[PDB]
Amino acid sequence: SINWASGEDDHVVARAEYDFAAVSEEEISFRAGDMLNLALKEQQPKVRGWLLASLDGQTTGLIPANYVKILGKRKGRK
Ligand SMILES: [Zn+2]
């Protein structure tokens, strides 16, 4: 298990431009201003137009790519 969601392993961070309420259990919710952890390219599930992300560092899921701005790669805390 690659622990990008917790930030224990290397991860990408993104800032939410808008609020988002998950309609599917595959999706996760967040608010404008939230920082989200994203899986590295290799662990991205390549669902067209979505990114695998975590807000709370435990629940991972899909978020709409144009609701966030990718800021950069971050070293795991381990
Ligand atoms: Zn981090």
Residue numbers in the entry: 264 to 341
Could you share sentences copied from the article?
Structures of the apo SH3 domain and SH3-(GS)2-FxxxF were solved by X-ray crystallography at 1.8Å and 2.3Å resolution, respectively. Analysis of the structure of the SH3 domain shows a network of polar contacts between the N- and C-terminal regions stabilizing the β1/β5 interaction, consistent with the extended domain boundaries observed by NMR. NMR {1H}-15N heteronuclear NOE (hetNOE) data, which report on backbone dynamics at sub nanosecond timescales, indicate that the PEX13 SH3 fold extends beyond the typical SH3 structural elements compared to the yeast Pex13 and other human SH3 domains. A comparison of the apo PEX13 SH3 and the complex structure show that the SH3 fold is highly similar (backbone coordinate RMSD = 0.39). Interestingly, nine out of the eleven Arg and Lys residues are located at the FxxxF binding surface, forming a positively charged surface area, which is favorable for binding negatively charged peptides such as the C-terminal FxxxF motif. In contrast, the PxxP binding site located at the opposite side of the SH3 domain, is mostly negatively charged. Notably, the human PEX13 SH3 interacts with (di)aromatic peptide motifs on a surface opposite to the PxxP binding region, as has previously been reported for yeast Pex1326.
